[PDB]
Amino acid sequence: GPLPRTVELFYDVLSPYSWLGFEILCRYQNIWNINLQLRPSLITGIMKDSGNKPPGLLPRKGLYMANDLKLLRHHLQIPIHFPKDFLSVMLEKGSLSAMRFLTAVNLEHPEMLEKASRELWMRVWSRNEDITEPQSILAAAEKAGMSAEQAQGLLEKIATPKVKNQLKETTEAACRYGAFGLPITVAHVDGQTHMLFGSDRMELLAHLLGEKWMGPIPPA
Amino acid sequence: GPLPRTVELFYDVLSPYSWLGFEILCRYQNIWNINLQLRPSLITGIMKDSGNKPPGLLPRKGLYMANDLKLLRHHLQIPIHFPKDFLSVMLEKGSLSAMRFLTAVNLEHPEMLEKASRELWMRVWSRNEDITEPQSILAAAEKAGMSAEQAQGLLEKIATPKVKNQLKETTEAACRYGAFGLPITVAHVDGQTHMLFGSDRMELLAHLLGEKWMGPIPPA
Numbered sequence: 005g006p007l008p009r010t011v012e013l014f015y016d017v018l019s020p021y022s023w024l025g026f027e028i029l030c031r032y033q034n035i036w037n038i039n040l041q042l043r044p045s046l047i048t049g050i051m052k053d054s055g056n057k058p059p060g061l062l063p064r065k066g067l068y069m070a071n072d073l074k075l076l077r078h079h080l081q082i083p084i085h086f087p088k089d090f091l092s093v094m095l096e097k098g099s100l101s102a103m104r105f106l107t108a109v110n111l112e113h114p115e116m117l118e119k120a121s122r123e124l125w126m127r128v129w130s131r132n133e134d135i136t137e138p139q140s141i142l143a144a145a146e147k148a149g150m151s152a153e154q155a156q157g158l159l160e161k162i163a164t165p166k167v168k169n170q171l172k173e174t175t176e177a178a179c180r181y182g183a184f185g186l187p188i189t190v191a192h193v194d195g196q197t198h199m200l201f202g203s204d205r206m207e208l209l210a211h212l213l214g215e216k217w218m219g220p221i222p223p224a
Numbered sequence: 225g226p227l228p229r230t231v232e233l234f235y236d237v238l239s240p241y242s243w244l245g246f247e248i249l250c251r252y253q254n255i256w257n258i259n260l261q262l263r264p265s266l267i268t269g270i271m272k273d274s275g276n277k278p279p280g281l282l283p284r285k286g287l288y289m290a291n292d293l294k295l296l297r298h299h300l301q302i303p304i305h306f307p308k309d310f311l312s313v314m315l316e317k318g319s320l321s322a323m324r325f326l327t328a329v330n331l332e333h334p335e336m337l338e339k340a341s342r343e344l345w346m347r348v349w350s351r352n353e354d355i356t357e358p359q360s361i362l363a364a365a366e367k368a369g370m371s372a373e374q375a376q377g378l379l380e381k382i383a384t385p386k387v388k389n390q391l392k393e394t395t396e397a398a399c400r401y402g403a404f405g406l407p408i409t410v411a412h413v414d415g416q417t418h419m420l421f422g423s424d425r426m427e428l429l430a431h432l433l434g435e436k437w438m439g440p441i442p443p444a
């Protein structure tokens with residue numbers, strides 16, 4: 005047994021596939037020999053930088069995504085639900101405030117970041133709730149186990165230079181790694197760096213790390 | 225024993241990811257309780273129908289795809305090789321005659337379709353040899369085990385409207401199942417039809433079929 009391998013996960017709670025990748029890595033983070041670093045990012049920034057556009061906007065792709073996630077819900081046991089209203093609506097509302105809030109968490113209480121992220125996804129991608137209003141974010145944060153005082157204080161820092169710059173810098177790191185969308189997983193292993201896109205490269209990751217893939221729901 | 229589940233695989237030899245999904249399904253076809261049905265298709269017809277564009281056209285995606293295939297080569301043990309800017313070259317030349325030939329094979333000698341398809345992929349995506357000239361296609365067909373006579377007889381039929389139309393119809397059937405690219409895999413199980421896009425949905429396919437996933441190289 006050697007030292008743990010650092011694995012960076014860049015994600016945005018706006019992204020349904022980011023949630024799937026996030027949960028698989030969280031499930032493996034104390035099974036595999038890895039150091040999982042969560043990297044809250046803005047898909048908006050990545051799209052702009054790369055000249056890419058949200059795949060779901062192409063109707064053939066959007067229809068397929070709804071089918072795919074409905075199956076993945078059961079396969080991965082993550083309560084992901086496609087929104088009742090059109091995707092364009094959720095996309096248009098976006099996730100700027102939520103991702104700024106997750107950034108403030110990472111800056112001050114990174115030990116809370118996994119739960120705060122999960123609770124935000126539970127709003128937008130499970131129960132089909134808003135993630136743009138202050139009250140919506142506070143609700144997710146209290147769900148994560150954050151005191152009201154604690155959550156309020158972080159929310160207050162959403163528009164501060166420190167938080168705004170950190171989110172921008174994390175998002176550009178993803179771009180420098182070659183992102184055109186999210187999630188991306190960056191594994192630093194045996195002296196090389198590998199960037200993997202999507203939630204469907206975790207078995208390949210296990211291979212690169214020399215670890216055993218036991219499916220998306222490993223036994224505890 | 226329950227009747228085998230029909231699994232349709234729509235593919236184009238122009239597409240390296242189609243080769244990957246094809247090899248995985250071929251490895252499982254005598255392990256899982258399935259009837260694998262190969263469906264020669266044209267990626268260009270699917271792009272047209274769906275209004276999609278080849279992903280490699282975006283530089284960051286093209287680069288990512290190049291990196292991903294290089295990793296998958298070892299993970300899946302498939303001898304893929306290509307020079308810089310190869311997809312740009314494949315786009316131009318296309319696979320029309322090759323895919324019409326495979327359509328003729330499917331109409332008259334479907335039992336030869338797997339090997340003929342494999343040999344064509346070996347030409348374009350392993351040795352980077354031509355697949356547009358008649359001599360090239362006949363070389364693959366003979367390597368696949370056809371007699372010179374059988375192969376030439378089939379190649380003569382790519383001039384026929386029946387073969388030309390059948391390739392178009394198969395490609396349209398992919399579109400009607402929701403395709404915006406290739407490969408797609410369509411599983412008919414428990415009275416339901418599920419379409420999965422990509423070479424990276426075979427573990428989910430195993431889940432849907434209630435079969436055991438043993439990775440991309442299942443044991444003998």
Ligand SMILES: CCCCCCSC[C@H](NC(=O)CC[C@H]([NH3+])C(=O)O)C(=O)NCC(=O)O
Nearest residue numbers: 018019020021059060095185186202203204
């Ligand atoms: C608000 C709703 C927006 C929903 C978008 C889908 S998640 C974002 C999207 N990610 C993916 O398409 C991942 C698909 C991949 N196959 C997986 O399984 O994870 C992307 O950045 N795509 C980049 C690309 O394909 O170019």
Ligand SMILES: CCCCCCSC[C@H](NC(=O)CC[C@H]([NH3+])C(=O)O)C(=O)NCC(=O)O
Nearest residue numbers: 239240241279289290311405406422423424
């Ligand atoms: C070296 C460059 C190689 C480029 C190969 C393109 S093969 C065609 C392409 N297929 C895919 O992107 C499949 C990717 C998928 N992640 C997989 O693993 O199979 C497609 O129809 N894509 C549809 C889409 O992405 O919109």
